[PDB]
């Protein structure tokens, strides 16, 4: 989440359409952007993995967190032996903590930047 | 859209992504080329030793005269006479068409143009490597380590006036004790300086800066010095096949600085230097699968050490595992330095960024590609296959997008044999590719940020500009006793009539219904094919194979109004700066 | 007079002479500049007393935060917001065009950049004076004597990777009770040596010899360290304005041995050392209109006297009466120092020839003038006036020939307010001048060996930097409180279409017909410009002013290729000399 559902959709419109071959390409290449697309095939396996200590889970085991090549960060349990279940996603509350305060960390750090730029 | 046709005889709309190809290359040059790089690595003439006639004769190439061959040129009278000429000598340039042939002693495998800052006007030259034998045939297996000789010729100036009579000068060669050489890239820019250059006796105004991929598994970097500086400060008298021995500015191996333990990596099989200024980081791809760089300017203790001789040894800064069988072809993103694609035997095309290593941004799974090129304005990268997976008459040139746009990849030129080697000219948008049946084509591509199924047809858009025919008259000289060599050249003047003319029909001809040729050398076979970098000479195109032979040709039908302005344009601009 | 166009959108004849001073100035400061000079005056660590906060109280600067400033930039989004910043710091470099702004506390009347030799890469300072109250003002008349403090300001080395996110840092100061400082100058070469220079704690390594004109009537000489080597020093948990009380390395001031009568000279006013080596010689002027030289190495019992601490107190070799009246500016010849020039408010500019000071060489009646600037390779000198006699409409900017080539005076640049100030890039071969109007221009001169009377549009060859407007929200506190400092930058990118482009259209708009305003503070007018003499950032330029805040600014479209391959050059050959 970077911005307004409509807002984003005309950002990414306009740089894959900039007949500047500099800002097309690094649009169009930087899978961050694009993480699904046409022909881009998808990037939903496993970047990273990091157990947390022992204690952590509902029972006495511990947790698995869980990084996505398309960003998505989670935490895994086993809470019964057969099937792990999604405890939480980060990735979503994350950016939902950033749009909530304009992606600017301290409250007047710098203005709110054009996210046509 | 845009229509009629331009005074070249293409349509508009086919000439249109050429012309608009001129102003986005100039632009980035601006933007991301310098005029200077690497001022440390000035080439020192007490490191270029002059070996003697009898000290040179290992190193030289085996054959002493070319085959016997004749050229044809497209509605002139048939010459019929036919050329043959020595070991490091060329043909003089044809008085109205500037074509010329020159031989180099053996089957060239690697080629580049010397790159110069547009509007210098300099004279132009090519690097090559023409194996010694040819009959020699190396497994990729194997480290070679063999002796062999890189080769630098001079082409003059190629402005109009000189082209008439214009020959190829033999300059120098470095004899090198590595092996066969696989790949030829110079520094793309910021490494050329003038050869009026004030510079103390020892030291000689750079021409270049080039890097070798050798055999041997290792990276030679050589800067190079201008000609006359050398033979100024070489004596008079000297031999004048002037092969030095030469030690490098530094030399490229994967290692570290203690491990001894020999790399798995094999041969070195590519090269890319990064594409933008300053040029800091050097790629080469590898037969065990890797993709190795190393960081030139490089201070640190863990990547840097000078040996007794003063050459540097640099080990790589990373190193990653690209693919599953050797890396046969790199090429390197210019509009943005983080991406790189790169091919393998294994047949996949991965995009990659060099951020993030671990999983490439796209792998397509094609035909067994032999050459890349990635033209900077468009996403997609064009690819040159080997035959031996594609269905009959379904191999040829590809265009492959990176996968965004999400275009079927373009069929740009069907082809019977492989196509051995490709470039792409970012001033023409256009590419050039060399197949073992002999034949040099040109294709335009279209406007790559629309969609390709809408081309009505791609014919249209490539013609001949060569086709070698074996005629009578497998051992090399089993073959050169019993056949010469029918270069038969297009009329490059224009595009008039194209499909009609005699050598788009030969070509039809050749795509689908011609047969590969087998139970011979394939001394028809092209290997290497370059359109120029340069501004200055922008519509010049270099190509050689297993002839030896090395031909220069000029596109004068892309050459046109725009370009020649943009070239007077910075020319101009240059004289005003340097002087 | 070479035709067509650069690629930063100027005429190639308008920029050939900025890509000639780059030769010109390097070629110099080879033969006439030097790496070490006066070795015995360096840093001691007991020299420098750090002072306590209650201490420092007294001498800083005494407004606390800025006034309220905005700047837009040439294309870009209008930003909107209001920025306020602490006394002593410094908003964030914008990310694509790297303009710096911090604030002093007070009215800017000091500047000047540390010089550094060339290829050293250095960390980048200047050194500046602004007055302890925004709306005090001093005669001239009278010795001031009062409290203020030199401040000494880190850029950062202004490498392209450096400058996205660089701030300025305050490293430290110097607290002065010699009144206010009217003219700063460093030794021009050879006062600077690498931080890294290994020496025995009670030294530090050497930053630069900084002249201090102060309103006390006298010279003050000062050796600077490197901050690192005073922090080394320094208690980890001193205050963070780094305040010191300083000794001199020597008061320099007019007098004899045993002559106890006060001289008449009054206030020193402006300064210049000797631009070539050893840099010897030191000239100030004085209200009273003498030019007066100190021979700074002097052993002689009749010049020299060492104080109970141990400083130095420096009477003059030389003196004579240049001026009828207070002589407000010096300029002293590069290319040969037998000559200087000077400027008094009798409004005449006076060339000497130091060997025969009895009559200059030549007296041109002029408007009364603030400051001149001598570019190296010009034989004549560009004024700055104030207005006050000038005729309306022909006020502003003029180079005047020393007198051979005898060409009329050239109008560089029209100006309704007063030029406040005025710095010659030597390396450029352009002028930047400040105005009461709040604006800052850039000029680039012609290849003035060539009559100027050709050049029959000057208008071409300006360009705003920025223009400071008082947009509303005879005292500062009524001024802030209802105004705020709008500062429009030009885009510096390039000069494409600059006649066309609003910012000149502003500009157009302002000389000639705007109206100066006198029912205000004038916070907006800007008070000292400095273009760097360093060839590392040689492209950089820095002023302020009344508002107290200081800008800095990249003119990316006079940077050059040649700047780039003189810069690497230049590098090399300084890492192969310190190391």
Known sequence: ?117 | HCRGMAPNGLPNHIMAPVWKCLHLTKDFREQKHSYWEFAEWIPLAWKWHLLSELEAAPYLPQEEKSPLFSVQREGLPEDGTLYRINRFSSITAHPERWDVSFFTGGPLWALDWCPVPEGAGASQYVALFSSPDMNETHPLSQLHSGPGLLQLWGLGTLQQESCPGNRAHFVYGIACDNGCIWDLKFCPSGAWELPGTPRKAPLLPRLGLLALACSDGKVLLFSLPHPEALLAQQPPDAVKPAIYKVQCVATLQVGSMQATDPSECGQCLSLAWMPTRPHQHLAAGYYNGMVVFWNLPTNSPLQRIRLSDGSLKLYPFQCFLAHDQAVRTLQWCKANSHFLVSAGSDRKIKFWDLRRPYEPINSIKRFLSTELAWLLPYNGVTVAQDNCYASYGLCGIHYIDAGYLGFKAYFTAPRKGTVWSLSGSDWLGTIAAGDISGELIAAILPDMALNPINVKRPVERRFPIYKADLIPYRTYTETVNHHYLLFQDTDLGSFHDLLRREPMLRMQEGEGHSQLCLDRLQLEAIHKVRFSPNLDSYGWLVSGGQSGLVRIHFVRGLASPLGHRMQLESRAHFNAMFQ
């Not at chain 1, 970077?2 to 071959?21: I, L, N, R, W």
């Not at chain 1, 993995?49 to 998505?72: E, F, I, V, Y």
């Open chain 1, 1 to 117: 989440k970077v911005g307004s559902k409509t807002e984003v959709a005309e950002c990414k419109e306009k740089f894959a359409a900039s007949k500047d071959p500099t800002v097309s390409q690094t649009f169009m290449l930087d899978r961050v952007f694009n993480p699904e697309g046409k022909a881009l095939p998808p990037m939903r396996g496993f970047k990273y993995t990091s157990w947390s200590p022992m204690g952590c889970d509902a029972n006495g085991r511990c947790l698995l967190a869980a990084l996505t090549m398309d960003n998505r960060l989670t935490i895994q349990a086993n809470l019964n032996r057969l099937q792990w279940v999604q405890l939480v996603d980060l990735t979503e509350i994350y950016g939902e903590r950033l749009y909530e305060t304009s992606y600017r960390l301290s409250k007047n750090e710098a203005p709110e930047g054009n996210l046509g730029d």
